[PDB]
Design a binder for this molecule. Structure first.
Ligand SMILES: CC(C)n1cnc2c(NCc3ccc(-c4ccccn4)cc3)nc(N3CCOCC3)nc21
Lengths: 326, 248, 826
């Protein structure tokens, strides 16, 4: 049946090439021999045998077989290398996680400078991302690695979230110790810069706000190399963490340690004054310092900016293809 | 989409183990020993109850596709617990599972691990994953015992006695093939039902529908008493054959 | 890691802007000409221009303006670089010693902002109270010109109008006032605001918004006699001052877009206008004085003067002399006469300044069997199209062969003693239903001619509608002789067929040498071409014979000969064809993992593919198997302009951001993943747009030439006419030259006080990295031009390595020899 994963062989796919390098193996583009569908194969190598099958892949299998949303990437099956016949110990062949093939990734489209986003294209982008983030948050899962490279958009204007290698369940009642450094420094939330370690789903919302701002400038907002410099850049824009706006900042491990140059005032609305009013309000609420005052995924979907977007009107981004040469 | 992980009691007469000449009593004994091995090892390691149960459900499922005569059970058990730890985010190093296994197992039993215990377990991970068809998410009677108990309102002390007694039954049902016959939701109800009969409690009074004598039907739709009694019979038989008596 | 050296063989020749004023002395009339990164200062004479000074700047010159604040004797110069480096400069001369003073400087980049579509705009107040900068959408940046602002500190005023086309500071206003044409969904409008340095905000401007032409392009601030502004469009020129609105719509300007403007008479009575077909107009402002003692504008008139080179910048000098600065063709001095000549023209060319124009493609060929090599470049566009033959002999000798149409690709075929050149000409839909060319060109002045009669797409059934006046490109293959450069033959391709790629080679066991062209069927409706041809021609006995044609399902962007087989890139696919004994192309193997295979290069059985957005990939042909294998890819994303192979392990690429990089095989076989990661080991901001990389050198090689430290030679051609050379170094030579750069940068004074390290930093809107793996040859070759005190200051405590001596001190005289040897490669 369709559900008997791990047995079908990777012979069934014609490998087109290597689309990218992942965490637990390389990612390849491939065509299914039977259907002609294009797939993306993530290679999982347990040959290292340091600690066996990688947990990053275990998370992505465990969670993505549970999550069924248009804006969440779909794992179709898990296939294997030709296994050694009647010799299970010597078998070092790897496993492949089959996904749908998405035409492009956001970082590539922006780094190459080949995308222009109108307000209406940003509306369709964010409604899908937040709707899928909402779906995940309603299911009590945190992504913990929202970057532009984990947002896949195909030319049809459909957005899908993808690298769940760091996803774990969140319980509001049961506070649990979690890994401090989770989201990429450019998109890292302020609380994790101070090391909350018991963070809320709001961490993902901060990353998406960073994307929201980035889509309006085409340049990431908080570009730093070190955790302190990042807190400085965030502070120059959002204001310095202080009990006046974040009463519990005093509870954070590095609060007294990582002071910014000044106690800056918030200028987010001034430095982003070129943004439409409905959007600017969304950015201000998503880039709120205190995670308990930062808006939820649902609240962004009930905003003037996203509330009245019809997903029938996908409005694909302006991707130049001809005349890019001349 | 998703695989079916529940069989009928009559089907257990045809596990690989049975067809290689193992009798029903022996396979049942092997299942109890392998599960209790998983439980005790993880308890020493400080593992969450869900992690222990997940390993057991993997273990029980595994020997629905393979024979106990070709796959030594304590190696299988150790592997299941090792994977369960990663699945449930309570990870342990394989060397630490082997260490605890050595303490709890006698020399003959630890012989199953062969000359290199850690390797034999790590190798089996490939087979385990293919056997469970990479369906790693598992639900356990515990969550439903607490979700349903939260909706009961009444004497704080009578309900807590019901829950703890039912909890002990859930732990004991893991040593049985019930995990492979009935969904966890039914198990949680069955253990509430059992604890109720023994404690002379009438659970319907604690529900929002106090004159609905089949109290469970608001929690688990379509469950006949036939099923709940079958489950209760199986759990109590484990207490009668063993020395232990009802928890009270 | 990898070590390489980049040197400029010919400086940028395109004129990007030109201004006039009194910069060198309050007395002299100056002409400042800006080429990319280069500033040329001239003094206006009665015969032409007297050069006085040239400086380089560590930045692309984006804004260039002269102004004279109260208290100064002479004009000061403002320059803003494309990296947002601002400075104010002064000319100072002490007898024979000429130097440029940096009076104020700073970087005006904002942490947050959207770069505007119409680019950086910089304007200065008529009272020189402030500098206006339009850098980002929705923001107006003000640098107030107070004496104390030596760092050029500035503030932003919120601008409601996000999409601004153009802005100027208006004349005759009680306060500083800006006039701008902006775009919103309701069309284009002209609006005015006032600028308050005290309040640091806009106040309501003198006159109301008026709706303007949809394609309103340029704003002219008219001087005091008639205060106001003129708005230039595609069809109409309009004047707006308060309630006065006048508009002229002469049919002559509708034909070609007007791109430049300049004031002839300071009163504002006459302005010059230029358009894309090179036509030069006079815009005459007709005066009406009122009995009130006031001067008003009676009418606007446009008069055609003649033809100039397609001009990026115009500036009127004196008498009848006008400087024509062209980026597409040669710049000029032309004289405007009061009386027309017998052809009706008032314009007569005086001097012609060489511009290698846009270098679309180029090849190196030893025409005279000299062992040297000459560079035949495809240069210029449209009517200024040309082929340029460049040879060394101390200055480069450049011959220009006018084509009068846009050249696209060039390749040399020795067997035929001729070149093949792809070209396109612009024709316009005419009343016959067909098209008519605006002027004769090479594709029409060929001795013999042909037109492909291919029936491949003949079935069509795709409706394409034509409106009178629309432009079309007509593509041709030109056979041009290597000695005379007579256009021997011109082959015209199918209607709507673009010629994209060209090779000359033999295939298989076929002894004939062919011209092969790859094409694309281009229809306005298509996002990406879905039809195309590979055509095999034979040039024999003065006639081009169509030998074979292969239909493809895309655009043949790039082709290259590959060990007797034809390697071609069709959109996503990279394909290898074999040439059969039946003289037809047969597909052997394909590679499909690409977005758009724009560029191809080969070496042995290795193929380097340049992609639209995925940078560079190293492929290989496995002959034992008859297919392709991906060896390694550059996973860092980049938009490619051209690529080249340096050696079996190092690969060179160019970015659309004016950046260069080198990728190398990781050469570490620990994991398969390491082997497949091409690692960028070289990063360098060139400052130019590289279109073509070509192996070769123009230096005479007698085998007796002292062996240079550098190994290898790659020449490259850019949009601004700049020609450069990339060559490799040993680890020892790099470290020496790199350590010397750091010493030179501390010693050499930069114009605008721009840090050299900043200038060469890799720069995209999203990234900025320090340069690596590249030696700036121009900094190294400037050591020979610094004064002796500075030379000895540079060599202090300098030590050599990895050579005859493990630690050897350097003297100033030792380096003079090394750098001189390095000057022999360019
Ligand atoms: C595995 C699954 C989640 N998946 C499904 N479709 C995609 C997907 N699709 C976007 C994508 C598509 C094409 C290319 C590409 C094309 C030609 C040459 C080189 N790369 C890159 C990214 N890109 C990624 N990531 C790209 C960056 O690395 C890591 C993988 N994963 C995906």
């Amino acid at each position: 049946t369709e559900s008997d994963w791990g047995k079908r062989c990777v012979d069934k796919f014609d490998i087109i090439g290597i689309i990218g390098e992942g965490t637990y193996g390389q990612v390849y583009k491939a065509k299914d021999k039977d259907t002609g569908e294009l797939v993306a194969l993530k290679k999982v190598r347990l040959d290292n045998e340091k600690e066996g099958f990688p947990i990053t892949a275990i998370r992505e299998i465990k969670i993505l077989r549970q999550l069924i949303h248009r804006s969440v990437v779909n794992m179709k099956e898990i296939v294997t290398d030709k296994q050694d016949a009647l010799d299970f110990k010597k078998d070092k062949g790897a496993f492949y996680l089959v996904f749908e093939y998405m035409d492009h990734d956001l970082m590539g489209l922006l780094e190459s400078g080949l995308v222009h986003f109108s307000e209406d294209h940003i509306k369709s982008f964010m409604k899908q991302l937040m709707e899928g983030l909402e779906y995940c948050h309603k299911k009590n899962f945190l992504h913990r690695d929202i970057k532009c490279s984990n947002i896949l958009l195909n030319n049809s204007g459909q957005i899908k979230l993808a690298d769940f290698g760091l996803a774990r369940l969140y319980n509001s009642e049961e506070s649990r110790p979690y890994t401090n450094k989770v989201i990429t420094l450019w998109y890292r939330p302020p609380e994790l810069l101070l090391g909350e370690e018991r963070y809320t789903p709001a961490i993902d919302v901060w990353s998406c706000g960073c994307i929201l701002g980035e889509l309006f400038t085409k340049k990431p907002i908080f570009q730093a190399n070190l955790e302190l410099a990042q807190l400085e850049l965030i502070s120059r824009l959002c204001g310095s963490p202080c009990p006046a706006v974040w009463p519990d900042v005093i509870r954070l491990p590095y609060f007294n340690t990582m002071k910014p140059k000044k106690q800056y005032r918030r200028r987010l609305r001034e430095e982003f004054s070129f943004i439409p009013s409905a959007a600017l309000d969304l950015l201000d609420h998503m880039l709120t310092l205190d995670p308990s005052k930062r808006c939820t995924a649902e609240q962004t979907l009930q905003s003037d900016f996203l509330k009245d977007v019809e997903l029938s009107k996908m409005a694909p981004p302006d991707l130049p293809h001809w005349q890019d040469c001349h | 989409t998703k695989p079916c992980w529940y069989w009928d009691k009559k089907d257990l007469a045809h596990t690989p183990s049975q067809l290689e000449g193992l009798d029903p009593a022996t396979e049942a004994r092997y299942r109890r020993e392998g599960a209790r091995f998983i439980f005790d090892v993880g308890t020493r390691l400080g593992l969450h109850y869900d992690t222990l149960a997940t390993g057991i459900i993997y273990f029980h499922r595994f020997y629905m596709f393979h024979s106990f005569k070709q796959f030594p059970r304590y190696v299988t058990g150790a592997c299941c617990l090792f994977l369960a730890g990663k699945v449930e985010e309570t990870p342990k190093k394989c060397k630490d599972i082997i260490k605890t296994a050595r303490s709890l197992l006698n020399d003959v039993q630890f012989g199953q691990f062969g000359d290199d215990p850690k390797e034999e377990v790590m190798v089996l991970e490939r087979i385990l994953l293919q056997t469970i068809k990479f369906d790693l998410q598992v639900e356990h009677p515990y969550q439903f015992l607490l979700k349903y108990a939260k909706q009961l309102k009444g004497d704080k002390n009578k309900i807590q006695k019901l829950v703890q007694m039912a909890w002990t039954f859930v732990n004991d049902s893991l040593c049985t093939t019930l995990s492979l016959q009935w969904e966890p939701e039914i198990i949680a109800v069955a253990v509430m039902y059992l604890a109720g009969r023994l404690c002379k409690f009438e659970i319907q009074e604690w529900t929002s529908k106090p004159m609905y004598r089949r109290w469970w039907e608001q929690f688990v739709q379509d469950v006949p008493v036939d099923v709940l009694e079958d489950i209760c019979h199986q759990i109590l038989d484990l207490y009668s054959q063993g020395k232990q008596q009802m928890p009270h | 890691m990898s070590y390489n050296y980049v040197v400029t063989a010919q400086k940028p020749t395109a004129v990007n802007g030109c201004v006039t004023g009194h910069f060198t002395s309050a007395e002299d009339l100056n002409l400042l000409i800006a080429k990319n990164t280069r500033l040329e200062i001239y003094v206006v004479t009665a015969e032409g221009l007297r050069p006085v000074k040239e400086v380089g700047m560590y930045g692309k010159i984006a804004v260039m303006e002269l102004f004279r604040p109260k208290g100064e004797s002479k004009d000061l110069l403002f320059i803003l670089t494309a990296k947002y480096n601002a400075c104010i400069l002064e000319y100072k001369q002490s007898g024979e010693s000429i130097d440029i003073i940096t009076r104020a400087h700073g970087n005006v980049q904002d942490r947050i902002g959207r770069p505007s579509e119409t680019g950086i705009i910089g304007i200065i107040d008529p009272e020189c109270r402030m500098i206006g900068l339009r850098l980002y959408d929705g923001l107006f940046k003000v640098i107030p010109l107070d004496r104390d602002n030596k760092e050029l500190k500035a503030f932003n005023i919120r601008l409601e109008e996000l999409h601004v086309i153009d802005v100027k500071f208006l004349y005759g206003c009680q306060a500083p006032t800006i006039c701008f044409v902006y775009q919103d969904p309701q069309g284009r409008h002209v609006k005015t605001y006032e600028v308050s340095l005290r309040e640091k905000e806009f106040n309501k401007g003198p006159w109301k918004q008026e709706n303007v032409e949809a394609e309103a392009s340029m704003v002219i601030a008219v001087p005091e006699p008639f205060g106001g502004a003129i708005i230039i469009g595609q069809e109409s020129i309009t004047y707006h001052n308060g309630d006065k609105y006048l508009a002229i719509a002469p049919p002559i300007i509708k034909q070609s877009t007007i791109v430049c403007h300049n004031r002839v008479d300071p009163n504002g009575s006459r302005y010059l206008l230029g358009d894309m077909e090179g036509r030069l107009f006079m815009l005459l402002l007709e005066k009406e004085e009122q009995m009130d003692g006031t001067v008003t504008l009676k009418d606007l008139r446009v008069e055609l003067l003649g033809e100039t080179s397609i001009a990026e910048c115009l500036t009127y000098l004196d008498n009848g002399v006008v400087f024509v600065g062209s980026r597409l063709g040669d710049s000029q001095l032309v004289k405007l006469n009061v009386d027309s000549n017998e052809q009706g023209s008032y314009v007569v060319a005086m001097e012609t300044f060489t511009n290698l124009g846009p270098i679309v493609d180029m090849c190196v060929v030893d025409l005279e069997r000299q062992g040297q090599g000459q560079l035949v470049t495809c240069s210029g566009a449209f009517k200024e199209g040309s082929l340029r033959i460049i040879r060394n002999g101390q200055k480069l000798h450049i011959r220009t062969v006018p084509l009068y149409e846009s050249p696209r690709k060039i390749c040399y075929q020795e067997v035929s003693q001729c070149f093949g050149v792809l070209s396109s000409r612009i024709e316009v839909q005419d009343t016959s239903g067909g098209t008519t060319a605006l002027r004769p060109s090479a594709s029409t002045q060929a001795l013999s001619s042909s037109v492909s009669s291919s029936k491949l797409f003949s079935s069509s059934t795709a409706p394409h509608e034509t409106s009178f006046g629309e432009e079309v490109e007509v593509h041709n293959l030109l056979i041009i002789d290597q000695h005379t450069f007579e256009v021997l033959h011109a082959h015209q391709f199918l209607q709507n067929e673009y010629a994209l790629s060209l090779v000359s080679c033999k295939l298989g066991k076929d002894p004939n040498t062919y011209f092969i062209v790859g094409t694309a069927m281009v229809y306005p409706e298509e996002a990406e071409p879905k039809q195309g041809r590979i055509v095999v021609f034979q040039y024999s006995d003065g006639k081009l014979q169509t030998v074979a044609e292969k239909e493809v399902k895309g655009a043949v962007y790039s082709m290259v000969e590959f060990n007797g087989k034809l390697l071609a890139s069709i959109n996503s696919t990279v394909r290898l064809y074999e040439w059969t004994t039946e003289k037809e192309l047969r597909t052997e193997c394909n590679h499909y993992n690409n977005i758009m295979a724009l560029y191809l290069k080969t070496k042995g059985d290795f193929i380097l593919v340049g992609d639209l957005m995925r940078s560079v990939l190293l492929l290989a042909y496995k002959p034992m198997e008859g297919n392709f294998e991906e060896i390694a890819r550059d996973f860092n994303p980049n938009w490619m302009s051209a690529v080249e192979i340096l050696d079996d392990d190092n690969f060179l690429g160019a970015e659309n951001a004016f950046n260069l990089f080198v990728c190398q095989k990781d050469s570490a076989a620990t994991t398969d993943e390491e082997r497949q990661h091409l690692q960028e080991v070289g990063l360098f901001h060139l400052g130019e747009f590289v279109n073509v990389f070509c192996h070769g050198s123009l230096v005479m090689q007698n085998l007796g030439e002292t062996s240079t430290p550098t190994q290898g030679s790659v020449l490259f051609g850019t949009v601004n006419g700049m020609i450069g050379l990339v060559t490799s170094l040993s680890e020892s030579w790099y470290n020496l030259l790199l350590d010397m750069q750091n010493r030179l940068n501390k010693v050499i004074k930069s114009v605008g006080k721009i840090e050299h390290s900043f200038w060469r930093s890799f720069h995209t809107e999203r990234k900025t990295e320090p340069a690596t793996g590249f030696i700036d040859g121009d900094l190294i070759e400037s050591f020979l031009d610094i004064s002796r005190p500075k030379m000895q200051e540079v060599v202090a405590n300098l030590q050599y390595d990895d050579g005859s001596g493990m630690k050897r001190e350097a003297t100033a005289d030792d380096l003079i020899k090394v750098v001189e040897e390095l000057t022999r490669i360019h």
